[PDB]
Amino acid sequence: GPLGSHMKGPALEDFSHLPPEQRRKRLQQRIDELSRELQKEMDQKDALNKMKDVYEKNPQMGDPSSLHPKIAETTSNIERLRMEIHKNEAWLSEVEGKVSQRSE
Numbered sequence: 001g002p003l004g005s006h007m008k009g010p011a012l013e014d015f016s017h018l019p020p021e022q023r024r025k026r027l028q029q030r031i032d033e034l035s036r037e038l039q040k041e042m043d044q045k046d047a048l049n050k051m052k053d054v055y056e057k058n059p060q061m062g063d064p065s066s067l068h069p070k071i072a073e074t075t076s077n078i079e080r081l082r083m084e085i086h087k088n089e090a091w092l093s094e095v096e097g098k099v100s101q102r103s104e
Helices: 022-058 064-095
Strands: none
Touching: 022 064
16 A cells, blocks of 8 residues: 555654644654754755865865765755654644644
């Protein structure tokens, strides 16, 4: 089944198996991790872009093309982490719209 929740290990695209209130609490914690993780990668990219420039202005360091895989993967992790923030926010859009567990 294409909709059989084919998730990549710890990368859950669900969090629905727990109730909205408990859910959003974990979503906030997930966003916490991902945003803090992303902060590293975003900085890492700028560092790599800076580093690349150093390799360009001063080949003393080495070859800038050897840093192309660096920037590529670094940016890929940036996208990866950011979209994982988005998925959480997407669920929050639902969860925070229905914080009540229906009627009593």
